[PDB]
Design an enzyme around this catalytic site. Sequence first.
Site, PDB file in Angstrom:
ATOM      1  N   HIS A 147       0.809  -1.232   0.103  1.00 33.63           N
ATOM      2  CA  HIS A 147      -0.128  -0.050   0.038  1.00 33.63           C
ATOM      3  C   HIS A 147       0.819   1.358   0.142  1.00 33.63           C
ATOM      4  O   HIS A 147       0.586   2.320  -0.314  1.00 33.63           O
ATOM      5  CB  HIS A 147      -0.918  -0.111   1.203  1.00 33.63           C
ATOM      6  CG  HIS A 147      -1.212  -1.223   1.687  1.00 33.63           C
ATOM      7  ND1 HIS A 147      -1.082  -1.725   3.108  1.00 33.63           N
ATOM      8  CD2 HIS A 147      -2.017  -2.314   1.319  1.00 33.63           C
ATOM      9  CE1 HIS A 147      -1.558  -2.811   3.388  1.00 33.63           C
ATOM     10  NE2 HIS A 147      -2.321  -3.283   2.076  1.00 33.63           N
TER      11      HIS A 147
ATOM     12  N   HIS B 258       6.016   7.198   5.995  1.00 28.58           N
ATOM     13  CA  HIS B 258       5.559   6.383   4.762  1.00 28.58           C
ATOM     14  C   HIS B 258       4.987   7.499   3.740  1.00 28.58           C
ATOM     15  O   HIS B 258       5.022   8.623   4.130  1.00 28.58           O
ATOM     16  CB  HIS B 258       4.539   5.300   4.989  1.00 28.58           C
ATOM     17  CG  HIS B 258       3.270   5.773   5.407  1.00 28.58           C
ATOM     18  ND1 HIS B 258       3.061   5.991   6.710  1.00 28.58           N
ATOM     19  CD2 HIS B 258       2.266   6.166   4.858  1.00 28.58           C
ATOM     20  CE1 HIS B 258       1.900   6.485   7.289  1.00 28.58           C
ATOM     21  NE2 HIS B 258       1.283   6.807   5.895  1.00 28.58           N
TER      22      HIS B 258
ATOM     23  N   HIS C 294       2.812   8.902   0.281  1.00 28.21           N
ATOM     24  CA  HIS C 294       1.661   8.471  -0.498  1.00 28.21           C
ATOM     25  C   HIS C 294       1.836   9.308  -2.038  1.00 28.21           C
ATOM     26  O   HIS C 294       2.265  10.396  -1.869  1.00 28.21           O
ATOM     27  CB  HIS C 294       0.174   8.970   0.112  1.00 28.21           C
ATOM     28  CG  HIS C 294       0.009   8.388   1.355  1.00 28.21           C
ATOM     29  ND1 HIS C 294      -0.921   7.130   1.433  1.00 28.21           N
ATOM     30  CD2 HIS C 294       0.096   8.563   2.615  1.00 28.21           C
ATOM     31  CE1 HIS C 294      -1.003   6.852   2.444  1.00 28.21           C
ATOM     32  NE2 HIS C 294      -0.324   7.828   3.351  1.00 28.21           N
TER      33      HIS C 294
ATOM     34  N   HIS D 281       3.867  10.985   5.572  1.00 25.38           N
ATOM     35  CA  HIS D 281       3.351  11.012   6.794  1.00 25.38           C
ATOM     36  C   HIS D 281       4.359  10.412   7.975  1.00 25.38           C
ATOM     37  O   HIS D 281       5.040   9.274   7.651  1.00 25.38           O
ATOM     38  CB  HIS D 281       2.116   9.945   6.906  1.00 25.38           C
ATOM     39  CG  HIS D 281       1.057  10.415   6.113  1.00 25.38           C
ATOM     40  ND1 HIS D 281       0.018   9.925   5.533  1.00 25.38           N
ATOM     41  CD2 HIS D 281       0.659  11.906   5.705  1.00 25.38           C
ATOM     42  CE1 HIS D 281      -0.890  10.703   4.973  1.00 25.38           C
ATOM     43  NE2 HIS D 281      -0.420  12.002   5.147  1.00 25.38           N
TER      44      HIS D 281
ATOM     45  N   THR E 205      -6.153   6.572   7.791  1.00 21.85           N
ATOM     46  CA  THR E 205      -6.572   6.742   6.375  1.00 21.85           C
ATOM     47  C   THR E 205      -6.497   5.419   5.601  1.00 21.85           C
ATOM     48  O   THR E 205      -6.960   5.149   4.384  1.00 21.85           O
ATOM     49  CB  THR E 205      -5.915   7.895   5.671  1.00 21.85           C
ATOM     50  OG1 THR E 205      -4.379   7.055   5.352  1.00 21.85           O
ATOM     51  CG2 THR E 205      -5.628   8.731   6.292  1.00 21.85           C
ATOM     52  N   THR E 206      -6.374   4.262   6.484  1.00 18.41           N
ATOM     53  CA  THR E 206      -6.569   2.695   6.307  1.00 18.41           C
ATOM     54  C   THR E 206      -7.089   2.123   7.395  1.00 18.41           C
ATOM     55  O   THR E 206      -6.925   2.532   8.521  1.00 18.41           O
ATOM     56  CB  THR E 206      -5.085   2.403   5.690  1.00 18.41           C
ATOM     57  OG1 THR E 206      -4.382   1.948   6.988  1.00 18.41           O
ATOM     58  CG2 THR E 206      -4.328   3.042   4.814  1.00 18.41           C
TER      59      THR E 206
END
Lengths: 251, 251
Positions: B60, B86, B88, B111, B192-193
């Site tokens: 992800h 991580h 995005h 993040h 957000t997951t």
Amino acid sequence: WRYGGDPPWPRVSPACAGRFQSPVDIRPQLAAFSPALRPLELLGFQLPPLPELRLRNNGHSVQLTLPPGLEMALGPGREYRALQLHLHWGAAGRPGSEHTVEGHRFPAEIHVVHLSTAFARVDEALGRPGGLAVLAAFLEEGPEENSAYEQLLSRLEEIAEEGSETQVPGLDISALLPSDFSRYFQYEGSLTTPPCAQGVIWTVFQQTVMLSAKQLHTLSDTLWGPGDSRLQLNFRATQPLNGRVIEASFP
Amino acid sequence: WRYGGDPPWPRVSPACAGRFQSPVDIRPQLAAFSPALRPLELLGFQLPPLPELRLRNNGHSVQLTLPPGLEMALGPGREYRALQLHLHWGAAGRPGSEHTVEGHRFPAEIHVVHLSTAFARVDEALGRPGGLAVLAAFLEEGPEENSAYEQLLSRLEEIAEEGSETQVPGLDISALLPSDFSRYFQYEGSLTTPPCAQGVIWTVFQQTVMLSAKQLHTLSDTLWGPGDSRLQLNFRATQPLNGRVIEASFP
Ligand SMILES: CCCCCN1C(=O)c2ccc(S(N)(=O)=O)cc2S1(=O)=O
Ligand SMILES: CCCCCN1C(=O)c2ccc(S(N)(=O)=O)cc2S1(=O)=O
Ligand SMILES: [Zn+2]
Ligand SMILES: [Zn+2]
């Protein structure tokens, strides 16, 4: 631990010497206006006469136990359930509020203690940021007998002995609080007695509540604490902010 | 769970259907100036080369596990410790930030996920007010090569397979973030997951970080996700504020 001299509170509870303790001196000119602060929401506070509520003299205060279903929101999704309320007060001719405003100590102060609904138990919440939230209001002298406070004050004589307790009819808990739920100071601090746990969100109403002189005297003059002693001046000294900015919901 | 496919996220975690999710569209005009919001402070972020960090393609995102001793304060008494970071990202000619500003999606987003010092582990913190805090920054195309980012991006080819990991030298984690720690937005939101737990304090920097066009291409074009497809557009749909106010640390 008692009010008025030793044992020194940090020797009882090292937490009492943490950096972010309550109460504090509010100085409105230094408070930060934060328009994100929305009006407090208090549902379920209008209790019917039954069931009855425990009012206990615990030697430190008089404490009313609140039933389930008093719900309070500090912001969207940030909700709480009320547990208990209790008072702080002075003595003949001396104010006894915990918080102060520009140095002014008020005749008395009411605290309504809530638990975050993200926590099942108070003890999970102790020490956790936002776990507990207290609503505080100043009690001042005014010309009239306050009817909501009178329901409590008229029962103090029955629990005058430290550790004694009575059952009162249900009352409107919200009727004990100020007019305007949109106007308040907020900061993060502590319990003001041992164990002095931090993470407590304090909301102090800008507006005060008014009791008669007879009523205030009743509050300070009726109850007996530890020893053969009078339950009076049951307040902690104000504590340094240590970098904390008190926020305000109003310009 | 995947970005685009099955299963639907509320089936995985009920919390992914909460009212107060992330990410959000930041509208700086509707943001409330809050002078209480002081500059963020980081301690321990300038890591030496050893011990090495684990960098993982988890299918992800690309996630760097952070070591102990990375301390972050949102303000006096709001103390956290870094767990992981991580990224995005989008695709060629498609932006992939999670947050947007006045509808504008940025090329990528970093993040840094943190845990409140009041909790020993993440599963205690989930759903609790202020239990987790994310520092977020947008990455934008820039003229020069970001050398802090080059350290991580040069190692991506090694973890091209989904579920693969490598060890990388420690680095200045703070150099992956903007240099201005005083201008930021802040709101309360969610992961957000899945499990999409709420209670998360999001701090979104106003200042952006600049990567070269090659760097952005390396990020979006190296890694592979589930099935036979590329790991790209690894961002959740913007979520409605639902009455939350975003604060800004600046007027
Ligand atoms: C498991 C119960 C332990 C915590 C109970 N509490 C206190 O000791 C204590 C002490 C002081 C206050 S005040 N002056 O509002 O801050 C409130 C409470 S409490 O949360 O009910
Ligand atoms: C016991 C469950 C452990 C949860 C750990 N985490 C996540 O699931 C999760 C999901 C999304 C993010 S993001 N995209 O920044 O918000 C961060 C995290 S996490 O705290 O490390
Ligand atoms: Zn109290
Ligand atoms: Zn993320």
